[PDB]
Design a protein around this ligand. Structure first.
Ligand SMILES: [Ca+2]
Ligand SMILES: [Ca+2]
Ligand SMILES: [Ca+2]
Lengths: 165, 165
């Protein structure tokens, strides 16, 4: 069980940091034949749910992450129509739609260019993208309760929410 | 010159991607006895100046980056008053002030937690921090029309500016 691996890598504090999380996820086999997650992707995964700002992730938060990772993995396989093991612009656009985001062509362009390596978006980068989209949206939503699609941010708040990710 | 190193790694399009930039900067000696830059840091250095959204860096952008890196390098030497080769909370506070940014102790704490390892911020992470602070502050300033320290953002705009870095 992935939960058994969590316990095995948790260490003395019963919670995982980026490095421990990377070990747990790699042992889980969630990445299949794709490359394991990078330390950076695991760090952002933690930042996404680090409500207490401790740089670590508790088990209950991990259950939420695991659920999200499996949904994102299915989306990846769904949109990877050519089975390249990489997500191209039109595929990523589809995945973004599957996740519920309504983004402009330019934003999509920016995202593809930012996450591409040698021309392609591999699983690790794809997941990192999904994580950041969710983390940034969580922050934005706290300033957009009416869900109007706009929000005011004081500079300091803006940096706190974005620099933490 | 550093531009000689740029020309040595530049692609046939006269630009460099994150990996080619990494090689150029390693040859430049901007780090001295410090470590080379991580791929992630080089990727955001490119993003910071990717005004034409090509995911690559041309000569003009590199010259701008080189100037910024030297500014950040000099600031690093200035604030690392105990010669630890690393920047601690108090020292980063000074550096952020030298960069012309005014943030709260709370935001400072968020930044230190994000980039420090055992209380120390090493060169690569320090530069990554400087890059993101500049990029996000410039993005915020563009929307802060009245220059009052607060700005309203359309959701998609917010995501493009933040996902870009
Ligand atoms: Ca632990
Ligand atoms: Ca594909
Ligand atoms: Ca120091």
């Amino acid at each position: 069980s992935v939960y058994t691996y969590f316990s095995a890598v948790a260490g003395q504090d019963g919670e995982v940091d980026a490095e421990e999380l990377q070990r747990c996820l790699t042992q889980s086999g969630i990445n299949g034949t794709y490359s394991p997650f990078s330390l950076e992707t695991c760090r952002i995964m933690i930042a996404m749910l680090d409500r207490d700002h401790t740089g670590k992730m508790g088990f209950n938060a991990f259950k939420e992450l695991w659920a999200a990772l499996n949904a994102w993995k299915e989306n990846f396989m769904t949109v990877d129509q050519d089975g390249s093991g990489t997500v191209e612009h039109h595929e990523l656009r589809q995945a973004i739609g599957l996740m519920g985001y309504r983004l402009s062509p330019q934003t999509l362009t920016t995202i593809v260019k930012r996450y591409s390596k040698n021309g392609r978006i591999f699983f690790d980068d794809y997941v990192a993208c999904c994580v950041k989209l969710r983390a940034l949206t969580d922050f934005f939503r706290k300033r957009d309760h009416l869900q109007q699609g706009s929000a005011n941010f004081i500079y300091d708040d803006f940096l706190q929410g974005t620099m933490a990710i």
